[PDB]
Amino acid sequence: NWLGGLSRAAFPKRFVFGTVTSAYQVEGMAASGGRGPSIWDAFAHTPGNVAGNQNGDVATDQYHRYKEDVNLMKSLNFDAYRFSISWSRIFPDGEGRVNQEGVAYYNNLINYLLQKGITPYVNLYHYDLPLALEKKYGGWLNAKMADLFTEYADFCFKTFGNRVKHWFTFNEPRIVALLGYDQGTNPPKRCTKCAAGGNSATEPYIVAHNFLLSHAAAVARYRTKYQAAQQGKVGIVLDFNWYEALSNSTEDQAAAQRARDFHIGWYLDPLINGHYPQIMQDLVKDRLPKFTPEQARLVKGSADYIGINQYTASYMKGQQLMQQTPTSYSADWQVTYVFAKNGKPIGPQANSNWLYIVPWGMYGCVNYIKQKYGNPTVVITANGMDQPANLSRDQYLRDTTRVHFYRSYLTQLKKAIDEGANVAGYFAWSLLDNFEWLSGYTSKFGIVYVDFNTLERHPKASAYWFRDMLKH
Ligand X SMILES: OC[C@H]1O[C@H](F)[C@H](O)[C@@H](O)[C@@H]1O
Q: Cβ of residue 444: shortest distance to ligand X, in angstroms?
A: 11
Q: Which does 61 bind (CB under 5 to 8 A by kind): Zn ion, ligand X, none?
A: Zn ion
Q: What is the DSSP string of 77-129?
A: T-SEEEEE--HHHHSTTSSSS--HHHHHHHHHHHHHHHHTT-EEEEES-SS--
Q: Cβ of residue 137: shortest distance to ligand X, in angstroms?
A: 24
171 versus 302: smaller Cβ distance to ligand X: 171
Q: How far apart are CA 443 and CA 354, in angstroms?
A: 12
Strand ranges in 124-188 using DSSP code E only, listed in sequence order: 166-171
Which 3 state secondary structure label does DSSP give 378? strand
41 versus 61: smaller Cβ distance to Zn ion: 61
Q: How far apart are CA 125 and CA 140, in angstroms?
A: 12
Q: Cβ of residue 25: shortest distance to ligand X, in angstroms?
A: 6
61 versus 261: smaller Cβ distance to Zn ion: 61
105 versus 465: smaller Cβ distance to Zn ion: 105
353 versus 454: smaller Cβ distance to Zn ion: 454
Site for Zn ion in 312-351 (CB under 5 A): none
HSE (CB half, 13 Å, CA atoms) of 425?
A: 24
> Closest CB to Zn ion belongs to which residue?
64
Site for Zn ion in 79-118 (CB under 5 A): none
Q: Cβ of residue 20: shortest distance to ligand X, in angstroms?
A: 7
Q: How far apart are CA 430 and CA 157, in angstroms?
A: 26
Q: Which does 8 bind (CB under 5 to 8 A by kind): Zn ion, ligand X, none?
A: none
- Work out whether the CA dihedral 104, 108, 111, 113 comes out positive or negative: negative
Q: Which does 64 bind (CB under 5 to 8 A by kind): ligand X, Zn ion, none?
A: Zn ion
72 versus 417: smaller Cβ distance to Zn ion: 72
**Residue 216 near residue 299, CB atoms below 8 Å:** yes
**Residue 71 near residue 38, CB atoms below 8 Å:** no
Q: Which does 128 bind (CB under 5 to 8 A by kind): Zn ion, ligand X, none?
A: none
**Residue 22 near residue 28, CB atoms below 8 Å:** no
Residues near ligand X (CB under 6 A):
22, 25, 171-172, 309, 382, 429, 436, 445
Q: Cβ of residue 341: shortest distance to ligand X, in angstroms?
A: 25
21 versus 199: smaller Cβ distance to ligand X: 21
> Would you tell me how many other CB atoms lie within 10 Å of the CB of residue 216?
26
Q: How far apart are CA 208 and CA 175, in angstroms?
A: 10
Measuring CA to CA, how many Å separate 472 from each of 17, 220, 437, 467? 12, 38, 35, 10
Q: Cβ of residue 432: shortest distance to ligand X, in angstroms?
A: 11
Amino acid present at 286: D
Burial of 420 (0-12, 13-18, 19+ CB in 10 A): exposed
Q: Cβ of residue 438: shortest distance to ligand X, in angstroms?
A: 10
Q: Cβ of residue 343: shortest distance to ligand X, in angstroms?
A: 29
Q: Which does 436 bind (CB under 5 to 8 A by kind): ligand X, Zn ion, none?
A: ligand X
> Closest CB to ligand X belongs to which residue?
382
Site for Zn ion in 48-77 (CB under 5 A): 61, 64
Q: Cβ of residue 347: shortest distance to ligand X, in angstroms?
A: 16
Q: Which does 399 bind (CB under 5 to 8 A by kind): ligand X, Zn ion, none?
A: none
32 versus 250: smaller Cβ distance to Zn ion: 32
61 versus 304: smaller Cβ distance to Zn ion: 61
Outline where 291-392 has alpha helix (H). Answer: 293-299, 329-332, 360-372
Q: Which residues bind Zn ion (CB under 5 A)?
A: 61, 64
